[PDB]
Symmetry: D2
Subunit: 343 residues, 4 copies
């Protein structure tokens, strides 16, 4: 099967499988896993931050960041189509007792003036705005790159008000590859960044949160509370090091395959916009087709293509390491045949 | 001072004060205060509900309702400019562990189709939508009346999905006076209603929640936890009975004073919409003025008029029993003079 | 009915009823109720503290104090039979995200060495101990007075660890009338104290939290969140001033009545300990009777005497202004008939 | 390398067999329920405990906390033993995450008197939280790995049934209990709604634990796991090791028991305050009451002579045996304990 559902389905490379077998391990509860310790040291250095914390998931990364940044009844400004709001189970409410303050954005880019206006005045009736979250790349909009200038402007606003800044940088390396902006440079405008090892960088498990020592110390106690305090997790960290240090550059190939796929899908007759394709995601609309997104997902699966429907009329196609250029070509031959059928 | 900040500043009538001194009381924790019991019975009867619960504040009313309607990790659909989101201290997050889902509206009226789209599908990544809140009158937009048809339609959608509906009817008798829709009719389209006694109806303290007996039982236990479990509160209920049964018709005097104020403010040259004024509120914009809202609020204070800024460019003027037509005329002389200064 | 259930059932004096009706009020949200402001100023003065906050209940008192003293995940040391653990609906967990750390005491008095041992070391696994609560008088033991020297030593321990101290002083004036220790001496060894107006001091509604300015400001925003931010609450504070300033001395009568009640009960043959009775409560054991605590409560009620069982073998009798000596003597005649029946 | 580590059974390292299995693991995206190695671990765990459904988690702390969440509403009370791990060593999570209050009940070596549990249940009254969960820990860590009898658990189950209260067993070391008692883990679990057990302690997996229970409960716990951040991707890597832990590493817990008993009996002969009669699984409590140092001073003296151990109070030390401490290591440590006894005695 050709799996275009998500970059989450990436499997470990042979180099990672080997590194996991030979991993040097220890009890991370005591700070004694040498591989964890090295991955964290590396993550911290790559983002120009004092400290780093490995977590079993990006959700946990964001949720411990929120905890470490907030007090009960605080408010978090985030983009209205962001993952923290949509896809993290209302955890910020339950775990941290904080309210989201959604601001609309153009492809993840909140207008700095709208962020300015979402910030609470000091008044008894109002929660305290203590955190602003920015997502790069932006997922719901189709893997779009927030301009560095937006992040720089929003950062400045936050300094003026003493408000912390988090980048949900689940796909920050995809952002860096597309934009040319080094991740240290995005990171410098943030108090904390969460990034995933387990999507396009192909590690089997986990993400990392980078930040200041005192922030990470708090986040590490948050992690213990939430159940992220693992033992000999250096098995996972071994894959994690290879993800971080060796698997970034080739993300360029995911973007090329995605753009190649979109252009060719448009030639066939599918309703796609290749000019919208900036990273590893292609949005496919089904309005011109005889079945909706859900029916077309089934027709694709029967022909050996996996994809998800994100609404009744939209499918998302996501490239990653485990879909090669050949697989893209194979998929296109299938998409051609299914156009003769469902157009 | 001519106090246009809010209708909360209403002081008790002479009859209220007499009834409070003479109040037949008991220990409400044992259900033994007869005057609370009677107020409750009356409020439930007037809204066409099984039961009612006295609370010390409208905020407590809304929050015990949220608690009684929801579980930890649920989502609450509400209007993007509603009081529960803006002026209730992030309590829904702290107290109930729930996420707000702000939907934009037109003067408090959320488009039913947007309410339908805000409902979370059943998926592991998603909170459960268990509550839709509707505010009538809608404060932020200028004490606007939400049309009945809007409330009926949203109620129809909630029924279809098994979602509770709550009305924040802090000023529901104002709505009813302007609209001619009885409060029993509004309430038939909701599972619960909070209404205030301490604003336009002139009681010194508190509000009531009305709904089913099992819901009210849950809300009564919540009230206990939150600290609204009082003792001989029949003192307060005695005024609240007078507020409910004697102070509703004269709200129309407040509507008239507000409209008159608006009409005269427009003729001076201020940025007001007298056609939008149908209850006890006027939104004044500072966009044609030399100072912003906060500068203009200081100037009014300095000449003897109290009002609140609701943004950097908008001021809310609220009428009530303690501002007479003479007071409004006196305030118009002052506004006239400050228009010379700041236009 | 002779009501020995609790001191909560106290009803307002004529003087209080007149003061409520003649109360000078304003909007407490704006800090403009002059009678609330005077009550607060007086409560602060009396406790030798810089600031005070009126609340609708003592439960809200304790809970806003916990909120203002704590962060999510902290731990609060309290006596194992204290009202905060037993009678406040699990609120500290819900509202503040904090764990109770029960320590056994001897009549409310926790052994300081045990308090020392319950303080958590700094360890990722451990919540931070940020608060120690002491209840005086201690209710479940029979209105027992905690020694000043106990509070003094626990205070010293707290200062070594940087831990806050809250006295649940619901009945601190009973303590003070019994011991001769002024409430400002108890409170000089604490950061905050909550005391009740609505129990033995006879106000219809409310309690007060005293403490430092910063702490009270936090407790005031917490109160807003919980729904205790009332409007023209001067009606209640009028009676509150009379309670604080005029109803304290006469608590000695309640104590004399409780003592007479215990001596006479013992002389009839009931299992009471008059040597334990130093305030307004008597614990009576049902061990020499043919019924348990609950069956005796029923027998009593059918003969016109109201009390509460606190276990299967114990009833608590409570004196207050609305059980006079005649009432105690009438009650004793009934208790004598029932001892013939049940002994 | 090259200290004798008696601090805990958490410190166990994977076997060669486990390392090969992880590296070679068949994986998928567990968010989709498509990791076949995870799926098989859960199938096997559920079956081993006589339950419909199982859920892999990254920590026992997560196992417990998703169980509490799945069992409770905000404001509820959880009855548990006063020295239980959920209370002491889980960072206040039950309060923050579930908004519930612990109701501590003192136990006798892990075992709460049934009637004490019954009196801890709240009546229906406005002032009281709802008692919705009773938690039982087996083995009980803090009393020295003590085995809660099956009959205690049976009786508590019966009380709970009568009041409609859920029962969670924190069986972090439930196979240790099972090996000592001869009671199959399915029997312990038959008197419980849910059980959490660790794979990463004495069973030697590098990461994780499992929750077992009914289908509808496990579905609720799976959504809580997603909320807390335990929803992983290609976790079959970890579950490869866990299948080996569950299927090959249970019987040899007998050796850890043998080692702890030997250790305690020999420590008793030397003259240390230990109770060999209390040692039935993999732990020894040693008191410092007849020594010139407290627990902390003794831990440092041990560290200085090549032995790692943890103070559990100012006067007590807990020695824990596990796969990476051999009989020979125990003998070495005893020879040192003997010298140190002369020093501090
Ligand atoms: Ca077509
Ligand atoms: Ca591959
Ligand atoms: Cl190793
Ligand atoms: Cl906090
Ligand atoms: Cl009366
Ligand atoms: Cl209108
Ligand atoms: Cl007045
Ligand atoms: Cl820590
Ligand atoms: Cl005493
Ligand atoms: Cl595979
Ligand atoms: Cl809940
Ligand atoms: Cl045992
Ligand atoms: Na010693």
């Amino acid at each position: 099967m050709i799996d275009l559902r998500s970059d989450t389905v990436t499997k470990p490379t042979e180099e990672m499988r080997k590194a996991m077998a030979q991993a040097e391990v220890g009890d991370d509860v005591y700070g004694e896993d040498p591989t964890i310790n090295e991955l964290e040291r590396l993550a911290a250095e790559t983002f120009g931050k004092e400290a780093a914390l490995f977590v079993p998931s990006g959700t946990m990364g964001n949720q411990v960041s929120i905890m470490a940044h907030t007090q009960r009844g605080d408010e978090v400004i985030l983009e209205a189509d962001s993952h923290i709001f949509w896809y993290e189970v209302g955890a910020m409410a339950v775990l941290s007792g904080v309210m989201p303050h959604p601001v609309p954005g153009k492809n993840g880019a909140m207008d700095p003036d709208d962020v300015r206006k979402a910030i609470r005045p000091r008044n008894i009736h109002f929660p305290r705005t203590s955190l602003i979250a920015i997502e790069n790349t932006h997922n719901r909009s189709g893997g779009r790159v927030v301009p560095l200038e937006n992040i720089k402007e929003i950062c400045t606003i936050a300094k003026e008000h003493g408000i912390n800044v988090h980048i949900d940088g689940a796909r920050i390396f995809n952002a860096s590859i597309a934009s040319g902006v080094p991740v240290k440079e995005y990171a410098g405008y943030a108090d904390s960044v969460m990034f995933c090892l387990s999507k396009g960088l192909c590690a089997p498990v986990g993400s990392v949160v980078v930040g200041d020592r005192d922030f990470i110390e708090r986040a590490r106690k948050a992690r213990k509370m939430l159940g992220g305090g693992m033992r000999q997790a250096g098995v996972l960290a071994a894959a994690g090091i290879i993800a971080l240090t060796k698997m970034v550059d080739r993300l360029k190939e995911d973007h090329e395959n995605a753009r190649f796929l979109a252009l060719k899908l448009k030639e066939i007759g599918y309703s796609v916009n290749p000019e919208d394709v900036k990273t590893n995601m292609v949005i496919l609309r089904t309005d011109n087709l005889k079945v909706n997104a859900h029916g077309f997902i089934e027709a694709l699966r029967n022909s050996g293509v996996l994809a998800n429907a994100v609404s009744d009329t939209e499918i998302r196609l996501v490239t990653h390491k485990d879909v090669s250029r050949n697989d893209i070509e194979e998929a296109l031959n299938i998409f051609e045949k299914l156009f003769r059928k469902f157009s």
